[PDB]
């Protein structure tokens, strides 16, 4: 009995930093954003940190830049669409661009 999975490509981008980060990342369909970040780190040149919360992990640092007071790393889908899901819940689609943006409130 055969079994199959699709390999998709997700573009990960961070424009809140100089220099900006932008890379195409290959993962299996069904991977979460957190799986994309893990693969980006394995490829080299991407780092991040997460912390636990009652609703799952969330980003506290991206490419060495920690969110400060009244700031957080926001997850968006290109062009400018906030995703109201955590990194461990959102499952990107083939060809999607995922952006991490440091925002203050």
UniProtKB/Swiss-Prot annotation:
Amino acids binding cob(II)alamin: 73-75
Subcellular location: Secreted
Superkingdom of origin organism: Eukaryota
Disorder named in the UniProt entry: Transcobalamin II deficiency: An autosomal recessive disorder manifesting in early infancy and characterized by failure to thrive, megaloblastic anemia, pancytopenia, and agammaglobulinemia. Additional features include methylmalonic aciduria, recurrent infections, vomiting and diarrhea. TCN2D may be accompanied by neurological complications, including psychomotor and mental developmental delay, if untreated.
Homology family: Belongs to the eukaryotic cobalamin transport proteins family.
Record function comment: Primary vitamin B12-binding and transport protein. Delivers cobalamin to cells.
Complexes and interactors: Interacts with CD320 (via LDL-receptor class A domains).
Identification of the protein by name: Transcobalamin-2
Encoding gene, per UniProt annotation: TCN2
Residues of the full protein shown: 325 to 427 of 427
């Amino acid at each position: 009995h055969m079994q199959t999975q699709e390999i998709i490509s997700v573009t990960l981008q961070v424009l809140s930093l100089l220099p900006p980060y932008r890379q195409s990342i290959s993962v299996l369909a069904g991977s979460t954003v957190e799986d994309v970040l893990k693969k980006a780190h394995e490829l080299g040149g991407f780092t991040y940190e997460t912390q636990a919360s009652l609703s799952g992990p969330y980003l506290t640092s991206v490419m060495g830049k920690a969110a400060g007071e009244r700031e957080f790393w926001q997850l968006l889908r290109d062009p400018n669409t906030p995703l109201l899901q955590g990194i461990a819940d959102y499952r990107p689609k083939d060809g999607e661009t995922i952006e991490l943006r440091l925002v203050s409130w």
